């Protein structure tokens, strides 16, 4: 056999490849098309680990499904991108990208070149950005009511919508506490310092955000207190045990007293560490590494409560919450490194497990959202929805501009692009106007998932958006009627919708540039 | 013939024949095989006529002696001063190869190299190990070059010192690292002070070494390759760089005689014998880049460029 | 060696020929050299079976039967060849045997030699068609030189010594040279008895070559008449009949029977008795008709039954039954009788005459044969071959076939060239001279043709133990010096090199056919430059 | 879910298909080229 | 047969056609990715790993090629990418077309040596003609020349329409990393611009960092993440609890020493860190690790420590900020110190959150200007293709700034060379003449491919181009027509020097030289022996 490329190297090319990519993308779109809006339905995904994921989140769904077509791979990747960047719009992006590729299929069948289509798409994207920024409105982020409405307009499309007020307040409190500035750098890190702990049982209405943190831990010794009302807290990265040296420290004994002297020396070392700790007069000591029983003895003699092996992330949150500074050498321990600011340390039994609360903090720059509910799956969905809520709150606090929902923004932008296209005289006017009408898919899908007549409602809406001050008009995903968003209250973050449009248009551009698939070749 | 894994015994013998021709002359390895094959193909019909292989062999020996006589009579003497004759011989040898459009470039180089590595008045042969060939991808065959100095593929260890003018070069067959006896050696610590003392005395040992190196005027340092011991510790590299000395380690124990023959260096195996008379003076030592296709260390110019 | 090796400049399947991956192909000079290698192998196999001192080959068939022979055509027919050029060489030998009946080994050796010389010419770069054309030129020169140096022999029935010498030359190389002159004499007498001198035709169907294990090779003889592998129908009939008046019949001595579908209906005791009497009277009438014609012997082709057999015995009419059509025809031709299809048509003029009809035994065997001989002017004849084993009997049969074919070729054209390689040496000399006078590039091809013609004398010398080159050069030099194209190889070491004196004689048509066939097949082989096969 | 044609349908389309047709024709020609003319040769097929 | 090699053997036109077929396969893979209208390819690595690309070198690296004559062209694309950074597709296409036409000549029985001589002559004269007639000085053209060269390189990439902005970024970056060294020659060391990828915001949102961008983060969450008057310490050693080396053992025989020895194991590193921090270092980058014990010292000092930084990133930050990478805190006095002169400086060092990750930005370094680029797209596929395209653009701008000559694009150079060489072939021999004509004709595969990809009438367009260039070469008053090439958005020739379609001369020159070398190497093959593996 005289081949040039290895067998298993299969090469497709041309309009078959183009149509295949577009069909794979629009299939990814049809998978989650119904998961958009307030009247969506849940999907039960089965993990390879025997798990279950009951969700409405586009990125959760697409991340749990597996594909082999590279266009579908790219669509799943852009859903991941939207989730990582803004944490919302994970299904709006998929649907818009699918519709853009769908409308590009026309021009590709009609002998237009993909580069022409792409240049038109990029023109349209810039003009979309312009139109969104013109129709956006500002926000007074000090207005907790405005912020709660922003968060409700984002979680109404999720399961927690029944506990909307609770979840909104939880997310707002968590983000406002995680807001932190040091050396002129503002930081809302709701991934390291807003923690969600799901404890099955109880009821969701008792879920709360703590003014402090919570870990699943107990005292090292039951003689230690489990309730302290003004704890001075010390955090350590070092083991309070006697460990070996880094070198070959081998000893050689010939005298009798030397063995006992060595063991007593170990004990004295632990005593000296514990005294270096006691000198700061703490109430609680929390370690990422072990704590020997002799160290426990000395701390208890000092009336200190110890928690043995905490995670680095939990320790960092305890630091931010109680105002402490993690240390690694109790000899280097300072009052500035001691943690004052926690208002109560409690260690209580939730079910048959012991949980440590460091709550009642003042100015805690970290938090723990304690979720309670029927099951790990329900609580996983509540946690994902709360991630959405907190990420939306964060996007707003960073860029306080808002845009109207219910497809109002899509219709306003489509109208503006159609109006700008009348000055266009080249051949790109057609793909340009096509992406403009391809933005209409969001209200179309909303109407479909509400169960109303897309033709009639979308026609009335496209007509409403030809009037002057009607860029706020959209549709209810709950009744199937056109309303003013100024009256309904569904306002999305400009950052979210910008990222959505950009990701959609660029995904379309990528899949349009793609041709001539090749496969088989092994790295 | 060596690359096609011939299996018949006679064909193997022809392979060995071509190798022997490559040894004795290095040119004619195809003509010799063709001549052998043809003589045997004629022996075929001779055998058929009914002549004995011994008679064929003796008559072939006769024809060989007469043919050597004939070729010598045809021949004309040559003076090694006849550079045009040498150029024409080289061009003829190259006409058969893919590099024949480049003969105008590679024949004068093939004549210069040999005329640079032999005493033309006394030489009766040539050792082509005096001619080093360095294959580097990139460029074209029109970029082949004849370097009178030294070329190395080993990389320079210093950052910032790539070029050296008026270069004094030293070969180091000893290791610039913490002392290590050839016997089992340990350093037993029993007090905390001995630890600080150990680190400090190691620093001082290395610094004394690099200072004895600097004191000679050496600015280029070729370190032999050393398994069983670190030939160039990071401390030594730090000190050499601070002292502005280019360092090329991992030199191979087979390139040593070549490097010495080239740049007049003398290999030093004990720091006590590392002096100025054991160095080599080169007008330049540079790490040259080849259009992003790699790097080469070129030691060009030499006060003792010895037949290499 | 592959039909198609691309699979496409775009990665898509390239299927042009069916099973192209399992198929092979050889093109060009390598195909030519493969052909030459195969032909040289065949020719070097055959050259040791050439001449008086040539040795035989022992062929074993699919079912394990053994055949010892020196005949090149029989060897190459029994040979299980797979190579197509070797198949062409088998066809070449078969063609020489068909046209001539001798030379079947010379043709193969000569063709192999021509291809072996073409090998060097192709190495020097000559076009194979130019080689073939030079071979045609040299072959024409050699054929005319044979016509030039040929001699003529008398093909009369008075002095048969030249024909006996020709047949002895033919049989010198065969195992039957122990009875050299006896075999030659009987081949000559056979063809001259059965040969149309005016027509110049010899029908070999009139020569029955029969072999029977037993006896000695010296017992082989020519019967001027017929021999049959049958006996008299009744064991009490006499085993000898002298001055036999023979009735040859193709009617079974049985009650008549229509060929058409017939049903004879018996409807009464009178009908049954009439049928009975009809059968009786039919048998009696058959025997009475044969007797009234005057015959002393009957020979039927279709066997008969108990009543007819006993009536023949009672009426003193020895009879043979179940005689085959061909031997019935030969018996008619030999005895001068006419074949009769029914008894009513039998007359004293349609009878044949044989002065002796005898049943012959073969020792402790139970096998009997019938000899019919002493006819007046038998235009048919039989060669009865005896010997100690079926292998030497079959070899004797084919050797005598060679001798008969040679006498046939003399009757067709009496011109004779002298053998022992002398004709080949003379033709090589003539071709060399004309190549010297030829100024075109075919000079080389003609020199090659001469060097190939010189392979037959070399092969004879080698098989005779002489040094090929030495012997051939001395006899060539003698031929050019003293003009005598009858100077050749003393294979039998009679001292003289003169083949005209040793009476080593070939047929001019034989040598000419050798040269022509070898050249034509070498041409068709050099014209091939591409082989395809699964 | 359901394919238009029967599984195993091989469709070659476009400029590559045309160039491949031309190349196959070149092969067929090569198979007979050397038989042309007074200096032409014969082919042996089995 | 006769040759007993244990392998397959191709010989003659068979292997020549095979070599050309392989080269054609490789070129047909990439032809569709040539020019502003070329399109990208997916490549799946047998596991679902996806790669989008238009870069021919990338494509041929990712492919698994089996034929050696095709491996040659893959290596050709790799070599073009190493020595130039652009032209990796054009060089392969041209090499394959030269191979095609040269094999056509060899089929017509022009000797391959003659084809090779003619190709070498045509390559030399094409290089000379370019250097003499088709170059424009970037000094005569200004900075818009660099912008146009970058935009020309970016056409055919996924940063095409955004070229208006990406070209500004590339030019600013290359001018930022411009540095002059000893010999006073200006050097533009690309690969010192850092390129980071972060899916997220649109392409237009990609950032040019005046300074440096590090794919690293601080070592401890208690450390600050912004520092303004950054004093930077670049260390090539690890900051960990000190362990005695291999040839040093602690053997205690007095228990009273164990405590002090164990404490020294940490106090050594503590002392080194205190020495570093005493000079004012608030930012400490390390190629090695930093134990938690040490990170706590940095935290308490209010410093920013970074561990496991890459050696090349550290070298660049040091060169850019004015720092000295230290492998050890050791001076020529046998002590351990850290001088404030070994520090570097920067107007800011921050940990910035890009998408869902974080990196470090070192902004406004003194003692040199540096440049980093954070590419922002929709997913990793886009980001990788943008990285490759940006590397191409950076290499192109580097070549334009090093050699101040550019040539027009759109097949202008190839059309001019086709005309000039088909006129020049008339002077050199008769068969080398045909070889030079075929070289000229081969050069036209570039505008042909551009038009084919643009879906335009390649025949008409290239004929118009050649007509323009012939008018330019025969009428001295219209020499400005040299600058005419294809406008692939309209299917009409155009003055590409005024349109801004520029290529560095080195691109075309090296393309021609390398393609010629590859064609000669492949054409020199007349046999192939493929040994059966063991
Ligand atoms: N009450 C509502 N009526 C109509 N549309 C709504 C309502 N609430 C949200 N939407 C719209 O639904 C979309 C969000 O749906 P969702 O399922 O959260 O998808 P994603 O967040 O992945 O885009 C936005 O267009 C938003 O404006
Ligand atoms: N007595 C003889 N002396 C010399 N040569 C002979 C003699 N008998 C036969 N030959 C030669 O041997 C050759 C081969 O003859 P033979 O083997 O009988 O049949 P074929 O010609 O088929 O091989 C003839 O060319 C003839 O010249
Ligand atoms: N704007 C343009 N108009 C016409 N031709 C162009 C333009 N930009 C680039 N080209 C041509 O595209 C060809 C190849 O470009 P590309 O495939 O991107 O890079 P390369 O082939 O050099 O790897 C070059 O011949 C170039 O002249
Ligand atoms: Mg949402
Ligand atoms: Mg030679
Ligand atoms: Mg005979
Ligand atoms: Mg390019």
Tab-separated table of C-alpha atoms in Angstrom, chain C residues 261-485:
chain	number	residue	atom	x	y	z
C	261	UNK	CA	-38.725	-47.636	-32.279
C	262	UNK	CA	-40.441	-50.935	-33.073
C	263	UNK	CA	-42.803	-53.323	-31.293
C	264	UNK	CA	-43.253	-56.798	-32.763
C	265	UNK	CA	-46.521	-58.119	-31.341
C	266	UNK	CA	-47.010	-61.808	-30.570
C	267	UNK	CA	-50.714	-62.619	-30.328
C	268	UNK	CA	-50.914	-66.411	-30.663
C	269	UNK	CA	-48.981	-69.632	-30.205
C	270	UNK	CA	-48.545	-69.607	-33.981
C	271	UNK	CA	-46.980	-66.140	-33.796
C	272	UNK	CA	-44.660	-67.373	-31.041
C	273	UNK	CA	-43.563	-70.424	-33.036
C	274	UNK	CA	-43.074	-68.252	-36.126
C	275	UNK	CA	-40.846	-65.916	-34.098
C	276	UNK	CA	-38.852	-68.903	-32.813
C	277	UNK	CA	-38.345	-70.267	-36.324
C	278	UNK	CA	-37.450	-66.791	-37.583
C	279	UNK	CA	-34.631	-66.512	-35.044
C	280	UNK	CA	-33.290	-69.991	-35.850
C	281	UNK	CA	-33.407	-69.318	-39.588
C	282	UNK	CA	-31.712	-65.927	-39.226
C	283	UNK	CA	-28.722	-67.518	-37.500
C	284	UNK	CA	-28.562	-70.313	-40.070
C	285	UNK	CA	-28.885	-67.865	-42.969
C	286	UNK	CA	-26.081	-65.643	-41.674
C	287	UNK	CA	-23.681	-68.566	-41.376
C	288	UNK	CA	-24.772	-69.960	-44.745
C	289	UNK	CA	-24.223	-66.624	-46.499
C	290	UNK	CA	-20.725	-66.352	-45.057
C	291	UNK	CA	-20.000	-69.919	-46.167
C	292	UNK	CA	-21.353	-69.525	-49.708
C	293	UNK	CA	-19.149	-66.481	-50.228
C	294	UNK	CA	-16.189	-68.848	-49.775
C	295	UNK	CA	-14.699	-67.233	-46.673
C	296	UNK	CA	-12.469	-69.182	-44.294
C	297	UNK	CA	-12.509	-66.458	-41.639
C	298	UNK	CA	-14.909	-63.800	-40.416
C	299	UNK	CA	-14.052	-60.581	-38.606
C	300	UNK	CA	-16.954	-58.656	-37.104
C	301	UNK	CA	-16.899	-55.273	-35.423
C	302	UNK	CA	-19.839	-55.716	-33.058
C	303	UNK	CA	-19.611	-59.096	-31.377
C	304	UNK	CA	-22.058	-61.972	-31.579
C	305	UNK	CA	-23.909	-64.533	-29.527
C	306	UNK	CA	-23.786	-68.197	-28.604
C	307	UNK	CA	-25.736	-69.633	-31.544
C	308	UNK	CA	-23.686	-67.701	-34.098
C	309	UNK	CA	-20.411	-68.608	-32.380
C	310	UNK	CA	-21.203	-72.312	-32.284
C	311	UNK	CA	-22.482	-72.300	-35.868
C	312	UNK	CA	-19.232	-70.675	-37.008
C	313	UNK	CA	-17.257	-73.340	-35.147
C	314	UNK	CA	-19.422	-76.125	-36.603
C	315	UNK	CA	-19.091	-74.718	-40.128
C	316	UNK	CA	-15.299	-74.326	-39.779
C	317	UNK	CA	-15.399	-70.518	-39.906
C	318	UNK	CA	-12.909	-69.123	-37.385
C	319	UNK	CA	-14.094	-65.704	-36.356
C	320	UNK	CA	-13.036	-62.620	-34.439
C	321	UNK	CA	-15.533	-60.328	-32.753
C	322	UNK	CA	-15.517	-56.905	-31.125
C	323	UNK	CA	-12.843	-55.660	-33.498
C	324	UNK	CA	-12.565	-51.897	-33.505
C	325	UNK	CA	-13.392	-49.631	-36.407
C	326	UNK	CA	-9.820	-48.450	-37.046
C	327	UNK	CA	-8.357	-51.961	-37.037
C	328	UNK	CA	-11.269	-53.168	-39.208
C	329	UNK	CA	-10.347	-50.424	-41.679
C	330	UNK	CA	-6.677	-51.402	-41.556
C	331	UNK	CA	-7.552	-55.083	-42.058
C	332	UNK	CA	-9.650	-54.240	-45.114
C	333	UNK	CA	-6.863	-52.078	-46.562
C	334	UNK	CA	-4.220	-54.718	-45.837
C	335	UNK	CA	-6.015	-57.847	-47.033
C	336	UNK	CA	-7.549	-56.142	-50.055
C	337	UNK	CA	-11.049	-56.727	-48.726
C	338	UNK	CA	-14.105	-54.518	-48.612
C	339	UNK	CA	-16.006	-53.735	-45.429
C	340	UNK	CA	-19.504	-55.224	-45.625
C	341	UNK	CA	-22.420	-53.811	-43.584
C	342	UNK	CA	-24.756	-56.809	-43.866
C	343	UNK	CA	-24.521	-60.478	-44.780
C	344	UNK	CA	-26.795	-60.227	-47.830
C	345	UNK	CA	-24.262	-57.832	-49.388
C	346	UNK	CA	-21.344	-60.260	-48.980
C	347	UNK	CA	-19.700	-61.734	-52.085
C	348	UNK	CA	-16.499	-63.550	-52.988
C	349	UNK	CA	-15.073	-60.307	-54.407
C	350	UNK	CA	-15.575	-58.249	-51.236
C	351	UNK	CA	-13.375	-60.697	-49.311
C	352	UNK	CA	-9.823	-60.005	-48.238
C	353	UNK	CA	-6.935	-62.431	-48.483
C	354	UNK	CA	-4.195	-63.078	-45.942
C	355	UNK	CA	-1.663	-65.842	-46.418
C	356	UNK	CA	-1.523	-66.319	-42.648
C	357	UNK	CA	-3.869	-65.466	-39.792
C	358	UNK	CA	-2.486	-66.585	-36.452
C	359	UNK	CA	-3.154	-66.223	-32.747
C	360	UNK	CA	0.007	-65.406	-30.805
C	361	UNK	CA	0.726	-66.008	-27.131
C	362	UNK	CA	2.948	-64.039	-24.770
C	363	UNK	CA	4.335	-66.492	-22.251
C	364	UNK	CA	2.677	-66.836	-18.855
C	365	UNK	CA	0.063	-64.169	-19.386
C	366	UNK	CA	-3.308	-65.441	-20.823
C	367	UNK	CA	-3.164	-62.574	-23.354
C	368	UNK	CA	-3.614	-63.319	-27.041
C	369	UNK	CA	-3.046	-61.284	-30.173
C	370	UNK	CA	-4.085	-61.904	-33.764
C	371	UNK	CA	-1.596	-61.416	-36.595
C	372	UNK	CA	-2.787	-60.950	-40.171
C	373	UNK	CA	0.032	-60.989	-42.701
C	374	UNK	CA	1.295	-62.502	-45.965
C	375	UNK	CA	-1.127	-60.245	-47.800
C	376	UNK	CA	-0.281	-59.598	-51.434
C	377	UNK	CA	0.371	-55.841	-51.529
C	378	UNK	CA	-0.529	-54.517	-48.064
C	379	UNK	CA	-0.870	-50.729	-48.134
C	380	UNK	CA	-1.043	-50.944	-44.329
C	381	UNK	CA	1.621	-52.074	-41.886
C	382	UNK	CA	2.235	-52.680	-38.185
C	383	UNK	CA	5.274	-52.151	-35.968
C	384	UNK	CA	5.132	-54.541	-33.022
C	385	UNK	CA	7.480	-53.353	-30.274
C	386	UNK	CA	8.762	-55.616	-27.505
C	387	UNK	CA	10.876	-54.855	-24.470
C	388	UNK	CA	11.513	-55.390	-20.807
C	389	UNK	CA	9.405	-52.556	-19.411
C	390	UNK	CA	6.652	-50.146	-20.372
C	391	UNK	CA	9.073	-47.229	-20.041
C	392	UNK	CA	11.442	-48.438	-22.733
C	393	UNK	CA	8.449	-49.529	-24.817
C	394	UNK	CA	6.961	-46.027	-24.736
C	395	UNK	CA	10.367	-44.511	-25.477
C	396	UNK	CA	10.790	-46.914	-28.402
C	397	UNK	CA	7.363	-45.906	-29.706
C	398	UNK	CA	8.226	-42.209	-29.712
C	399	UNK	CA	11.739	-42.823	-31.107
C	400	UNK	CA	10.313	-44.845	-33.985
C	401	UNK	CA	7.812	-42.041	-34.516
C	402	UNK	CA	10.791	-39.708	-34.950
C	403	UNK	CA	12.360	-42.068	-37.493
C	404	UNK	CA	9.108	-42.445	-39.445
C	405	UNK	CA	8.629	-38.670	-39.499
C	406	UNK	CA	12.168	-38.244	-40.823
C	407	UNK	CA	11.586	-40.700	-43.675
C	408	UNK	CA	8.325	-38.842	-44.352
C	409	UNK	CA	10.274	-35.583	-44.563
C	410	UNK	CA	12.660	-37.160	-47.065
C	411	UNK	CA	9.722	-38.321	-49.201
C	412	UNK	CA	8.431	-34.751	-49.094
C	413	UNK	CA	11.830	-33.188	-49.895
C	414	UNK	CA	14.891	-35.404	-50.408
C	415	UNK	CA	17.407	-32.605	-49.769
C	416	UNK	CA	19.790	-33.339	-46.911
C	417	UNK	CA	22.207	-31.305	-44.801
C	418	UNK	CA	24.958	-32.949	-42.776
C	419	UNK	CA	24.653	-32.850	-39.008
C	420	UNK	CA	26.964	-33.079	-36.037
C	421	UNK	CA	26.657	-29.306	-35.768
C	422	UNK	CA	28.260	-28.942	-39.205
C	423	UNK	CA	25.259	-27.179	-40.749
C	424	UNK	CA	25.077	-24.807	-37.780
C	425	UNK	CA	28.788	-24.003	-38.030
C	426	UNK	CA	28.465	-23.339	-41.767
C	427	UNK	CA	25.406	-21.127	-41.273
C	428	UNK	CA	27.241	-19.256	-38.519
C	429	UNK	CA	30.126	-18.640	-40.920
C	430	UNK	CA	27.763	-17.386	-43.633
C	431	UNK	CA	25.944	-15.095	-41.194
C	432	UNK	CA	29.237	-13.718	-39.883
C	433	UNK	CA	30.404	-12.942	-43.425
C	434	UNK	CA	27.168	-11.137	-44.264
C	435	UNK	CA	27.281	-9.233	-40.975
C	436	UNK	CA	30.767	-8.113	-41.979
C	437	UNK	CA	29.303	-6.806	-45.224
C	438	UNK	CA	26.367	-5.182	-43.359
C	439	UNK	CA	27.006	-1.536	-42.312
C	440	UNK	CA	23.793	-0.873	-40.326
C	441	UNK	CA	23.415	-1.347	-36.552
C	442	UNK	CA	22.063	-4.882	-37.076
C	443	UNK	CA	25.632	-6.145	-37.563
C	444	UNK	CA	25.598	-6.778	-33.814
C	445	UNK	CA	22.319	-8.710	-33.977
C	446	UNK	CA	23.645	-10.885	-36.798
C	447	UNK	CA	26.875	-11.595	-34.918
C	448	UNK	CA	24.657	-12.598	-31.990
C	449	UNK	CA	22.636	-14.871	-34.276
C	450	UNK	CA	25.869	-16.560	-35.379
C	451	UNK	CA	27.057	-16.979	-31.787
C	452	UNK	CA	23.662	-18.533	-31.045
C	453	UNK	CA	23.785	-20.925	-34.012
C	454	UNK	CA	27.112	-22.063	-32.591
C	455	UNK	CA	25.427	-23.334	-29.405
C	456	UNK	CA	24.326	-26.653	-30.952
C	457	UNK	CA	27.919	-27.734	-31.781
C	458	UNK	CA	29.003	-26.477	-28.350
C	459	UNK	CA	26.220	-28.489	-26.708
C	460	UNK	CA	27.162	-31.613	-28.668
C	461	UNK	CA	30.811	-31.202	-27.651
C	462	UNK	CA	29.912	-30.676	-23.993
C	463	UNK	CA	27.601	-33.701	-23.920
C	464	UNK	CA	30.383	-35.703	-25.594
C	465	UNK	CA	32.930	-34.611	-22.983
C	466	UNK	CA	35.003	-32.564	-25.424
C	467	UNK	CA	35.946	-28.980	-24.665
C	468	UNK	CA	33.237	-26.877	-26.374
C	469	UNK	CA	35.263	-23.839	-27.397
C	470	UNK	CA	38.393	-25.773	-28.413
C	471	UNK	CA	36.510	-28.346	-30.497
C	472	UNK	CA	34.238	-25.802	-32.155
C	473	UNK	CA	37.064	-23.410	-33.011
C	474	UNK	CA	39.132	-26.179	-34.586
C	475	UNK	CA	36.243	-27.456	-36.691
C	476	UNK	CA	35.206	-23.915	-37.680
C	477	UNK	CA	38.763	-23.109	-38.771
C	478	UNK	CA	38.840	-26.339	-40.753
C	479	UNK	CA	35.511	-25.509	-42.397
C	480	UNK	CA	36.712	-22.092	-43.594
C	481	UNK	CA	40.171	-23.390	-44.576
C	482	UNK	CA	39.169	-26.560	-46.424
C	483	UNK	CA	35.710	-25.794	-47.767
C	484	UNK	CA	33.625	-28.568	-46.251
C	485	UNK	CA	30.341	-27.699	-44.516
